[PDB]
Amino acid sequence: VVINISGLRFETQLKTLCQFPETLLGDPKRRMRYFDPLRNEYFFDRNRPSFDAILYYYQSGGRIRRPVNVPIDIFSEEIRFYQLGEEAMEKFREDEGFLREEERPLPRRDFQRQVWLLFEYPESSGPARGIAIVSVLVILISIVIFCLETLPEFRDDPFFVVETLCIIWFSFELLVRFFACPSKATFSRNIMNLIDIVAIIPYFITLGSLAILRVIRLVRVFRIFKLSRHSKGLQILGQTLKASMRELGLLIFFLFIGVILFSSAVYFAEADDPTSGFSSIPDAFWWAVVTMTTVGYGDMNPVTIGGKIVGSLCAIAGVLTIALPVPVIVSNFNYFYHRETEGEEQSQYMHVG
Amino acid sequence: VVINISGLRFETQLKTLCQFPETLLGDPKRRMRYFDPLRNEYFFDRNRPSFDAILYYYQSGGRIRRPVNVPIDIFSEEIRFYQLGEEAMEKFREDEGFLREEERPLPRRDFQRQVWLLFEYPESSGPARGIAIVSVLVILISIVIFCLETLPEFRDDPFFVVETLCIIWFSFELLVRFFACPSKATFSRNIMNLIDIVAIIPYFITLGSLAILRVIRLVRVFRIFKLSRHSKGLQILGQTLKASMRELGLLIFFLFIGVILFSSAVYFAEADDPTSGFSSIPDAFWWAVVTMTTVGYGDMNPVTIGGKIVGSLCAIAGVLTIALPVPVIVSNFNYFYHRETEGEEQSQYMHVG
Amino acid sequence: VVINISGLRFETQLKTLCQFPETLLGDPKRRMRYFDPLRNEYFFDRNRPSFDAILYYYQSGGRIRRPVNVPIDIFSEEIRFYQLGEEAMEKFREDEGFLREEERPLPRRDFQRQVWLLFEYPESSGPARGIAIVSVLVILISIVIFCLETLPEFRDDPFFVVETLCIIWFSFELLVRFFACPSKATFSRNIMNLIDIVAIIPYFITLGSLAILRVIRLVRVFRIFKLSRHSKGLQILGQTLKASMRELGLLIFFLFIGVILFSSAVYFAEADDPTSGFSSIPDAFWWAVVTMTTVGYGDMNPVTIGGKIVGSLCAIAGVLTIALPVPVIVSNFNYFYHRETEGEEQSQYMHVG
Amino acid sequence: VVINISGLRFETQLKTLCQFPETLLGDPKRRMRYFDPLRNEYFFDRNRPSFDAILYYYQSGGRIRRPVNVPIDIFSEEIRFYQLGEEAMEKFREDEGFLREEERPLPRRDFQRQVWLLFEYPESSGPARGIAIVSVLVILISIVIFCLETLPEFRDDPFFVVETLCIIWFSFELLVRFFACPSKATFSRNIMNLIDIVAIIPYFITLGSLAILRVIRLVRVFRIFKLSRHSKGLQILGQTLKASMRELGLLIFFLFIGVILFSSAVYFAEADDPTSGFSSIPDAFWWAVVTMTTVGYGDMNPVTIGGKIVGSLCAIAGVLTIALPVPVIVSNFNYFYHRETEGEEQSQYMHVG
Helix, strand or coil: CEEEECCEEEECCHHHHCCCCCCCCCCCCCHHHHEECCCCEEEECCCCCCHHHHHHHHHHCCCCCCCCCCCHHHHHHHHHHCCCCHHHHHHHHHHCCCCCCCCCCCCCCCHHHHHHCCCCCCCCCHHHHHHHHHHHHHHHHHHHHHHHHCCHHHHCCCCCCCHHHHHHHHHHHHHHHHCCCCCCCCCCCCHHHHCCHHHCCCCHHHHCCHHHHHHHHHHHHHHHHHHHCCCHHHHHHHHHHHCCHHHHHHHHHHHHHHHHHHHHHHHHCCCCCCCCCCCCCCCCHHHHHHHHCCCCCCCCCCCCCCCCCHHHHHHHHHHHHHCCCCCCHHHHHHHHHHCCCCCHHHHHHHHCC | CEEEECCEEEECCHHHHCCCCCCCCCCCCCHHHHEECCCCEEEECCCCCCHHHHHHHHHHCCCCCCCCCCCHHHHHHHHHHCCCCHHHHHHHHHHCCCCCCCCCCCCCCCHHHHHHCCCCCCCCCHHHHHHHHHHHHHHHHHHHHHHHHCCHHHHCCCCCCCHHHHHHHHHHHHHHHHCCCCCCCCCCCCHHHHCCHHHCCCCHHHHCCHHHHHHHHHHHHHHHHHHHCCCHHHHHHHHHHHCCHHHHHHHHHHHHHHHHHHHHHHHHCCCCCCCCCCCCCCCCHHHHHHHHCCCCCCCCCCCCCCCCCHHHHHHHHHHHHHCCCCCCHHHHHHHHHHCCCCCHHHHHHHHCC | CEEEECCEEEECCHHHHCCCCCCCCCCCCCHHHHEECCCCEEEECCCCCCHHHHHHHHHHCCCCCCCCCCCHHHHHHHHHHCCCCHHHHHHHHHHCCCCCCCCCCCCCCCHHHHHHCCCCCCCCCHHHHHHHHHHHHHHHHHHHHHHHHCCHHHHCCCCCCCHHHHHHHHHHHHHHHHCCCCCCCCCCCCHHHHCCHHHCCCCHHHHCCHHHHHHHHHHHHHHHHHHHCCCHHHHHHHHHHHCCHHHHHHHHHHHHHHHHHHHHHHHHCCCCCCCCCCCCCCCCHHHHHHHHCCCCCCCCCCCCCCCCCHHHHHHHHHHHHHCCCCCCHHHHHHHHHHCCCCCHHHHHHHHCC | CEEEECCEEEECCHHHHCCCCCCCCCCCCCHHHHEECCCCEEEECCCCCCHHHHHHHHHHCCCCCCCCCCCHHHHHHHHHHCCCCHHHHHHHHHHCCCCCCCCCCCCCCCHHHHHHCCCCCCCCCHHHHHHHHHHHHHHHHHHHHHHHHCCHHHHCCCCCCCHHHHHHHHHHHHHHHHCCCCCCCCCCCCHHHHCCHHHCCCCHHHHCCHHHHHHHHHHHHHHHHHHHCCCHHHHHHHHHHHCCHHHHHHHHHHHHHHHHHHHHHHHHCCCCCCCCCCCCCCCCHHHHHHHHCCCCCCCCCCCCCCCCCHHHHHHHHHHHHHCCCCCCHHHHHHHHHHCCCCCHHHHHHHHCC
16 A cells, blocks of 8 residues: 655555554545545645654554654644554553553542542642641641750750640541541552651650660651652652662762772871871771761871872762762652653643543 | 655645745745646755745644754745745744843833933943943942941941942932833832842931841842843843742752751760760751761761761762752753853844844 | 665665675575566565665665664664674674673583582572672671771780681682683783782781881782672772773872962962961972862961962862863763663663574 | 655756856766666765755755764765865865864974974974973973972072073973974964963073062962973863853852852851851951852851851852853863864864865
């Protein structure tokens, strides 16, 4: 068969177009209105370079590309015009990277679907927005009273009666969601819900082993992580830290080679001095990590020229061990920034049509 | 109809070309001189790949692209040759990003249009350039006498008779523009003119509540912002700070998570020491912000190994919280640098033709 | 001859296709089944833009390109379909950069090929993985006892009986590979094997000139480099340091211009002060290197305004001398990261077919 | 006329090809051997996409592009095959950026052209390489004796008899080039030769006003700049500093806004404290420049919370004022690195053919 896309002749076999017998070109009654019985061809008055990837979809047997010149709002119309189907439309989706939104879990009630739209979806309604302005205020007061409790003018109980205001309110915002979810096993895997409970598990022990009395106080600071729910930027931070496992491990490892190698070199170049502040290898560990990171503290300083040549080569190599696996992390942060701020806003406006 | 662009056959319907009945291809008396009655086609001896985007303009119904291979001085001629009109020429403008220059407000006088070309447009004439060499000298002396007034050899009035020289000259450069503008409501929105007046409002109170006597002195430093008018680079800085609102907010927020999380960790790892300099959580706030930024001050130092493992993980994570939203800011600065230094100089030389 | 690649007419001479008389198009009995005796041409129903680089392979006489639009899994099939041969397939290999894997040296035995697959190839079998979990544990204990030996609570012999456990185990892991290799001259060039022996050469002198007693202790730290064998990331670090010879030399040279030029400027601007801490040019060398690297130590500080203007211009220029040859190094690290993690996994899945 | 580039039909007028009546297509006796009297066309068996830019050269009237897909060693052959001439070949040169090498000034003698190839061209011959190994040794000794002269164990004359060895040798390497050049006005503009003489002008005053006795000593350090002649990397540094005038000025200006604005804010937030180390605005200038650059010195520290909030906002904004005009400088350094190391080595191997 011969197809004439506004002047460009594409000519393929008939059994290639019969592989997909539900599309425009596969159905002999839908493409029959585009025939041209004077030249024995089908004439479409469409975009020229967009058909080079439509014909390759039939030839390869199912793959969908996108040519570089044609934009996404143009190529999303040719799949809609040639009637390739939603199977081929969704295969165009993840090829561009934009994954479709997952279906929310419906609990199938009217009391339960209302309270699900009341708290977990704060953007929808009025009292949905009413909790969100106080779910920032309840968190910020709890972190700052945890700071104000540690202030030593009071340490070195009205400070108990102000913190129970925030914690039963923390318990208020959890007991309204303990019974209001579609599922319960999926409740125990979502890390948004996984730390919230840990905030109460450390307080319920307090009303009813010194090392244990301190450990708990450390978990009380976890309440900072509750800000991740209603803050859009932290998920971009949360996904970048969670997609960069094997690159973050190389960041702390590449300096650990530089810690041991340079603490030994500053030691043996200053072992022949009684006034040397570096007593041993764990003594000069803090010097080796404060010079490679280019902070500097000045507690332990080399004095001789043999020890002033290793730290100068330590600070130079200290940049060249920490700035090497960094720029893949700032690119992953740019990916989750560009697939949340203008990723789906430009995709789903012309991907769902 | 068949169009033959120097060997490449483009073939579209007649009602597609009749959508725009004022262009070259739409008018049956302007395209009639390009006919070829031996082959029944129109023959243009033009550039080949530039017509693929001209024909798509008719087919889509008004959109203008630009193919990647053809440069801007070539594609700006094909819109001029096919006579697509200024409506289609200006639709090509903002597609490339280069917005046209806005019309200046004409006050419609001869006394007023002369003084408008005298001060606000310093590049035009001689006395237009005469004020610009002294509108740098009047500003630099006022900031440095504000510095020299604060010098304590004189603090701990001939210093009044030197600062009134600059301020009535500041008032000279404002009263010549109070009455010389096209409009007055547009006068009160332009931020160039919005701070200039604030420079006098803080001085006129002085000739005619201790906290109030200090606040005013703080506004006197605002006179630095008057340098933004005649300096080309500060608008590139001013637009980059003003186009990066939601990214600058994430920069100060991502360290605020790192301030509280790391000040608690250095506290509880050093709470069991009487010689620990960290008294409390606001006490070690300054330590937490000076280590993540990699400055270091040395006023408060961890001494034990349990406290020397958190600051080493603080400085490493301190780079990975502040360098993440930075590279979008240095790209926006590159955009306003490339759309002011070679943006309009390459555009309007071939966009207005 | 005329070749019709699904609508696109390619037309070349016959002696061009006869340059390679073993391919599809060169053999008059293999291409004869694609003939079309009504139009006098050969009709292939293949991808359109992939044949523009197949025909140029015949015309140029052997070169293989790849067009930008067609991906690698598509263009690797057209070389497989047109039967260009493995000579042309391997010429496509290094054009994409992906070099094929070299053949391992076979020692041609059954005792020797088994022990070669036992230790040097730890990913293969069970006891191949059994040594790898203890070849990390034997190394980490040896570096930390070298740290613990230097701790001065014991310095200022049961610490001999714990280090011989690691060293005969180091000798265990070398004597199993002294006699188990295909070759011996290739044994003495591989830098993985070149430092391992140096670890014993410094210990065998110890059981059987003070400067010599210290030098040896410095080589004992070399045992850190033994971690490079079973760690995947260090080869990416090792290749980036070994491919950047002339760029690393310019990094230490560009600051050496800044060391001498700025130590002289801080000297002569502070030579007229008796309280100046800078005694001479090697005295202020440590100040010049700690300011350009932005660490800061505070041992020697300028006090006057003439000396506070050079260090402010030193720290500004100190970034602009060290950050200039850095970004080619972080790009080379990205190349060896992308040719080891997804380089050969995407290449050899469709390069060897 | 119709031109058939191996299957692609290009069809232009005859007067377009007659604009350049010396090329292949312009001469009716050179293109006559490519005619095809059965189809009435010219048949070239060349590369297909390379002719789209050859035909546009005739149509536009002289411009030469290069299409993106075709590499430089391919497109440099089509200009050689179609015989466009060296006028069109050199117009292809600077379009790719690679400027041709300038002709060296010939003094037209045999004594003078020999000594010109003896010293200024050290790569050519044996004694041309003989001076280059001692023109590094004569410079390095002169900078280090200028360092060793300033050492105070000798200050606080055999050190005169060692420095005259280097200076008459400096005079040896200048008097051999005073009389050995093609021109003398071009001698006084080349900045390589402009500082060399300044090295003697400061020594000839010494053998034959205290401020003048110190100034000279400062110029003696200029001898570092003599290393730029035989060092390949410094010209890449020298061109990057000399092509970035208006960007380097914005680097020192953007912090000068941050110096005055933040020194005033730290002053007025600490003016109500008698223990505040910041006496005045020039007193806290050194604090403001050491925090934005992230060095830190610790001489003057804020103590109150009102002064600990400005320096935390100073160090954050201090990165965002200095890292903004930096990445255009590291790109210019990459341009002069890629046009000196692989720029002309890949160009002139196929640009001069």
